[PDB]
Design a protein around this motif. Structure first.
Motif, PDB file in Angstrom:
ATOM      1  N   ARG B   6      33.385 -89.404   3.039  1.00 21.25           N
ATOM      2  CA  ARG B   6      32.906 -90.429   3.968  1.00 21.25           C
ATOM      3  C   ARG B   6      33.988 -90.984   4.894  1.00 21.25           C
ATOM      4  O   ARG B   6      35.191 -90.821   4.641  1.00 21.25           O
TER       5      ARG B   6
ATOM      6  N   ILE C  11      14.447 -91.719  -6.602  1.00 21.02           N
ATOM      7  CA  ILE C  11      14.610 -90.269  -6.461  1.00 21.02           C
ATOM      8  C   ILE C  11      16.042 -89.732  -6.204  1.00 21.02           C
ATOM      9  O   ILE C  11      16.248 -88.508  -6.165  1.00 21.02           O
ATOM     10  N   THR C  15      23.943 -93.848  -1.419  1.00 21.68           N
ATOM     11  CA  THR C  15      25.221 -94.353  -0.848  1.00 21.68           C
ATOM     12  C   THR C  15      25.239 -95.441   0.255  1.00 21.68           C
ATOM     13  O   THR C  15      26.254 -96.117   0.427  1.00 21.68           O
ATOM     14  N   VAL C  19      17.279 -94.185  -2.706  1.00 25.73           N
ATOM     15  CA  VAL C  19      16.248 -93.346  -2.092  1.00 25.73           C
ATOM     16  C   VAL C  19      15.016 -93.286  -2.989  1.00 25.73           C
ATOM     17  O   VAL C  19      15.088 -92.839  -4.135  1.00 25.73           O
ATOM     18  N   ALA C  32       9.617 -89.794   1.310  1.00 20.53           N
ATOM     19  CA  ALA C  32      10.866 -90.279   0.728  1.00 20.53           C
ATOM     20  C   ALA C  32      11.543 -91.262   1.687  1.00 20.53           C
ATOM     21  O   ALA C  32      11.852 -90.914   2.830  1.00 20.53           O
ATOM     22  N   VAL C  65      14.676 -80.695   6.980  1.00 20.97           N
ATOM     23  CA  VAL C  65      13.890 -81.852   6.551  1.00 20.97           C
ATOM     24  C   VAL C  65      13.396 -82.617   7.775  1.00 20.97           C
ATOM     25  O   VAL C  65      14.120 -82.769   8.762  1.00 20.97           O
ATOM     26  N   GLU C  82       9.670 -86.472   5.127  1.00 19.65           N
ATOM     27  CA  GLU C  82       8.730 -85.712   4.318  1.00 19.65           C
ATOM     28  C   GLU C  82       9.348 -85.650   2.927  1.00 19.65           C
ATOM     29  O   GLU C  82      10.574 -85.672   2.790  1.00 19.65           O
ATOM     30  N   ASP C  87      15.804 -81.228  -5.210  1.00 24.73           N
ATOM     31  CA  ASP C  87      16.884 -80.573  -4.488  1.00 24.73           C
ATOM     32  C   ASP C  87      17.355 -79.338  -5.246  1.00 24.73           C
ATOM     33  O   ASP C  87      17.083 -79.206  -6.442  1.00 24.73           O
ATOM     34  N   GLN C 132      22.704 -80.088  -3.653  1.00 25.89           N
ATOM     35  CA  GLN C 132      22.009 -81.372  -3.721  1.00 25.89           C
ATOM     36  C   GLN C 132      21.492 -81.824  -2.352  1.00 25.89           C
ATOM     37  O   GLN C 132      20.682 -82.759  -2.261  1.00 25.89           O
ATOM     38  N   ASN C 133      21.943 -81.137  -1.300  1.00 25.99           N
ATOM     39  CA  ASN C 133      21.518 -81.423   0.067  1.00 25.99           C
ATOM     40  C   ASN C 133      20.497 -80.417   0.595  1.00 25.99           C
ATOM     41  O   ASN C 133      20.102 -80.469   1.766  1.00 25.99           O
ATOM     42  N   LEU C 135      16.655 -79.005  -0.110  1.00 24.02           N
ATOM     43  CA  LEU C 135      15.420 -79.427  -0.774  1.00 24.02           C
ATOM     44  C   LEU C 135      14.398 -78.297  -0.888  1.00 24.02           C
ATOM     45  O   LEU C 135      14.263 -77.479   0.024  1.00 24.02           O
ATOM     46  N   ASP C 146      20.107 -84.103   4.219  1.00 22.42           N
ATOM     47  CA  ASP C 146      21.339 -84.872   4.354  1.00 22.42           C
ATOM     48  C   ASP C 146      22.163 -84.522   5.610  1.00 22.42           C
ATOM     49  O   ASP C 146      23.135 -83.758   5.542  1.00 22.42           O
TER      50      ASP C 146
HETATM   51  N1  LIG Z   1      12.869 -86.051   1.583  1.00 17.99           N
HETATM   52  C1  LIG Z   1      13.265 -85.968   0.289  1.00 17.99           C
HETATM   53  N2  LIG Z   1      12.462 -85.449  -0.675  1.00 17.99           N
HETATM   54  C2  LIG Z   1      12.865 -85.370  -1.965  1.00 17.99           C
HETATM   55  N3  LIG Z   1      14.070 -85.791  -2.398  1.00 17.99           N
HETATM   56  C3  LIG Z   1      14.971 -86.333  -1.536  1.00 17.99           C
HETATM   57  C4  LIG Z   1      14.606 -86.453  -0.112  1.00 17.99           C
HETATM   58  N4  LIG Z   1      15.652 -87.011   0.519  1.00 17.99           N
HETATM   59  C5  LIG Z   1      16.609 -87.231  -0.415  1.00 17.99           C
HETATM   60  N5  LIG Z   1      16.212 -86.823  -1.640  1.00 17.99           N
HETATM   61  C6  LIG Z   1      17.019 -86.929  -2.885  1.00 17.99           C
HETATM   62  O1  LIG Z   1      18.037 -87.926  -2.721  1.00 17.99           O
HETATM   63  C7  LIG Z   1      19.332 -87.345  -2.892  1.00 17.99           C
HETATM   64  C8  LIG Z   1      20.322 -87.943  -1.905  1.00 17.99           C
HETATM   65  O2  LIG Z   1      19.782 -88.009  -0.585  1.00 17.99           O
HETATM   66  P1  LIG Z   1      20.790 -87.939   0.669  1.00 17.99           P
HETATM   67  O3  LIG Z   1      21.601 -86.677   0.492  1.00 17.99           O
HETATM   68  O4  LIG Z   1      20.031 -88.179   1.952  1.00 17.99           O
HETATM   69  O5  LIG Z   1      21.686 -89.258   0.422  1.00 17.99           O
HETATM   70  P2  LIG Z   1      23.268 -89.286   0.690  1.00 17.99           P
HETATM   71  O6  LIG Z   1      23.794 -90.644   0.314  1.00 17.99           O
HETATM   72  O7  LIG Z   1      23.555 -88.786   2.087  1.00 17.99           O
HETATM   73  O8  LIG Z   1      23.797 -88.215  -0.398  1.00 17.99           O
HETATM   74  P3  LIG Z   1      24.016 -88.576  -1.968  1.00 17.99           P
HETATM   75  O9  LIG Z   1      22.855 -89.470  -2.339  1.00 17.99           O
HETATM   76  O10 LIG Z   1      23.980 -87.226  -2.662  1.00 17.99           O
HETATM   77  O11 LIG Z   1      25.361 -89.280  -1.998  1.00 17.99           O
HETATM   78  C9  LIG Z   1      19.150 -85.842  -2.728  1.00 17.99           C
HETATM   79  O12 LIG Z   1      20.078 -85.093  -3.524  1.00 17.99           O
HETATM   80  C10 LIG Z   1      17.728 -85.620  -3.193  1.00 17.99           C
HETATM   81  O13 LIG Z   1      17.703 -85.402  -4.609  1.00 17.99           O
END
Ligand SMILES: Nc1ncnc2c1ncn2[C@@H]1O[C@H](COP(=O)(O)OP(=O)(O)OP(=O)(O)O)[C@@H](O)[C@H]1O
Ligand SMILES: [Mg+2]
Lengths: 258, 19, 297
Positions: B6, C11, C15, C19, C32, C65, C82, C87, C132-133, C135, C146
């Motif tokens: 970040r 879910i 950060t 979510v 989501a 996404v 959506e 993931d 993890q990014n 889906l 992400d």
């Molecule tokens: N549209 C979606 N549908 C299902 N699950 C989702 C969706 N968006 C996010 N997630 C879940 O939330 C987690 C984190 O989302 P995202 O990567 O946007 O947050 P981040 O803060 O950028 O990354 P992290 O949470 O991994 O630090 C993903 O690993 C996934 O499991």
């Protein structure tokens, strides 16, 4: 690598149309004028110098201001706020290290508070629907520069200089697409420095010829010739330094032999 | 399993819009 | 304003807030929501939030996404996506028993390369491709998610942020501190992800930057001027680096066939100019029999 070069050029050329202000929005503004707009953009140039911001961030901000003023009516007393919010949004998009909001409060002699700058950012964001990835004169010049025969930084800096002069004058430059202003800018710079012309390879790439750039070119040429006498002077001062090879001190050609 | 990475020469001025 | 969404469950902690998974009470749509707390006296709307939105609003593709709505209060900013089942990371973990079948790995790679290719075509670098990014849904679709670390590049690129890409998936041109990176960084990541899909474990699991390089040099040999001109003059290259022989590439991911080997190798190519683009990679023989299987969940 050319790999994705042409794809991006097309997509930019598509997006630059959608990202356009209205030709004469300044007509319908009940309190602000072009002359005022020109005072704002000149100041934003200084803002970019004091913070060492990319020329692209400058170009982006002007685009945000023009699009915002196309749909929102603004008193003069709040024009600096919209200008500031724009610069901040552009900074957050484009820069690795954007300056903090306190800096954007500071450079306006505390005309507005930190909340005003923040609340304004949300308005600008709402009005631009979050479409901030706008094509710019710079994004195009950058691409055009790859067609130099060979690379000459005096040509580049000059074209950037020309391209920046165009942000000042809504009338006439709002009529032209960024890619067009960039065509004229790159050719006029090429011609001033080397005597060369808009190269064949860019005809193949852009569709544009020296004939279709003609109206934009002779606008820019008058702007270039008249530059020393403009009300706004920040760009000439900017491109006087070694960082830009002193191009604003180059002798412009008195004709373009078209 | 490991996070994502970040993230005054010019004086302040109130612009004068005269007309 | 937010009254139409009914929060079902959490879910995956994101950060800038948590979510959730939510339901539109009127249409029945499953979504989501990604919360972004703004506060008072901060630095305004975050730049990651600004980027994620603007570029995602430009990226309309089956394998990216879909952003549906940005509910734009003064107090908080909600992002509506959506929803997808889970993931990739969690999918592989519950598949760590009997593995993932090759038609499905093939299909997931194909779609990802499609989503990546659409991004690079729209001047966008993802810069955070990891499982993890990515889906997946119930039907066999896979998607880039992400875009919090994404940016819009120019032609040719400038110097961008250095601190970019999760360590294990970070290309060797970033680790060596190069003046310029580009689309290849996303392709490096996918290759690691491609292998990660086969073996279900990370290809290069390092715990520091120096450890990451060396792990790569043992797998792929230490790069030299002949395999990568410019390599020994890059800001963080050290002449002290141990010069590991390049191993037989079949040994990198043993279960890959001739076509898979070929494709991965071109993805983990050292010189970023010669690394395969997502574009070209779609024409690789590996995808001659590509199908769209349903994963078991
Ligand atoms: N549209 C979606 N549908 C299902 N699950 C989702 C969706 N968006 C996010 N997630 C879940 O939330 C987690 C984190 O989302 P995202 O990567 O946007 O947050 P981040 O803060 O950028 O990354 P992290 O949470 O991994 O630090 C993903 O690993 C996934 O499991
Ligand atoms: Mg993430």
């Amino acid at each position: 690598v050319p790999d994705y070069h042409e794809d991006i050029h097309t997509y930019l050329r598509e997006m630059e149309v959608k990202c356009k202000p209205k030709v004469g929005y300044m007509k319908k503004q009940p309190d602000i004028t072009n002359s005022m707009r020109a005072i704002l953009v000149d100041w934003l140039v200084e803002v970019g110098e004091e913070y060492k911001l990319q020329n692209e961030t400058l170009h982006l901000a002007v685009n945000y201001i023009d699009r915002f003023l196309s749909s929102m009516s603004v008193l003069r007393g709040k024009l600096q706020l919209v200008g500031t919010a724009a610069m901040l949004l552009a900074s957050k998009f484009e820069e690795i290290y954007p300056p903090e909001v306190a800096e954007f409060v500071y450079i306006t002699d505390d005309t507005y508070t930190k909340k005003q700058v923040l609340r304004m950012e949300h308005l600008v964001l709402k009005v631009l629907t979050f479409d901030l990835a706008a094509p710019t004169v710079n994004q195009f010049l950058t691409q055009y520069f790859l067609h130099q025969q060979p690379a000459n930084c005096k040509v580049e800096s000059l074209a950037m200089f020309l391209g920046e002069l165009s942000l000042i004058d809504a009338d006439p430059y709002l009529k032209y697409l960024p890619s067009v202003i960039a065509g004229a800018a790159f050719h006029l710079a090429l011609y001033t420095v080397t005597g060369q012309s808009w190269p064949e390879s860019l005809i193949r790439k852009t569709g544009y010829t020296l004939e279709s750039l003609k109206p934009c070119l002779m606008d820019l040429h008058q702007t270039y010739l008249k530059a020393p006498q403009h009300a706004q002077q920040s760009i000439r001062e900017k491109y006087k330094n070694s960082k830009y090879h002193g191009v604003s001190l180059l002798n412009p050609p008195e004709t373009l032999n078209l | 399993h490991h996070a994502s990475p970040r993230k005054h020469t010019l004086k302040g001025r109130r612009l004068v819009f005269d007309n | 304003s937010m009254e139409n969404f009914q929060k079902v469950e959490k879910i995956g902690e994101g950060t800038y807030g948590v979510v959730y998974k939510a339901r539109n009470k009127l249409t029945g749509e499953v979504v989501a929501l990604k919360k972004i707390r703004l506060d008072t006296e901060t630095e305004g709307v975050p730049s990651t939030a600004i980027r994620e939105i603007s570029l995602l609003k430009e990226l309309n593709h089956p394998n990216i996404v879909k952003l549906l709505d940005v509910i734009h209060t003064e107090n908080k900013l909600y992002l509506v996506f959506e929803f997808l089942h889970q993931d990739l990371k969690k999918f592989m973990d519950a598949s760590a028993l009997t593995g993932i079948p090759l038609p499905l790995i093939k299909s997931y790679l194909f779609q990802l390369l499609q989503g990546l290719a659409f991004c690079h075509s729209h001047r966008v670098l993802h810069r955070d491709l990891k499982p993890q990014n990515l889906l997946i849904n119930t039907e066999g679709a896979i998607k880039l998610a992400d875009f919090g670390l994404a940016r819009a590049f120019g032609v040719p690129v400038r110097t961008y942020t250095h601190e970019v890409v999760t360590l294990w998936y970070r290309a060797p041109e970033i680790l060596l501190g190069c003046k310029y990176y580009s689309t290849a960084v996303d392709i490096w990541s996918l290759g690691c992800i491609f292998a990660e899909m086969v073996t279900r474990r990370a290809l290069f699991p390092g715990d520091s930057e120096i450890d990451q390089l060396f792990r790569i040099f043992r797998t792929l040999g230490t790069p030299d001027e002949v395999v990568w001109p410019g390599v020994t003059s890059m800001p963080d290259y050290k002449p002290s680096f141990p010069k590991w022989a390049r191993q037989d590439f079949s040994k990198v991911v043993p279960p890959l066939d001739e076509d898979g080997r070929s494709l991965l190798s071109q993805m983990l190519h050292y010189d970023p100019n010669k690394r395969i683009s997502a574009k070209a990679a779609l024409a690789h023989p590996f995808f001659q029999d590509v199908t769209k299987p349903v994963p078991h969940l």
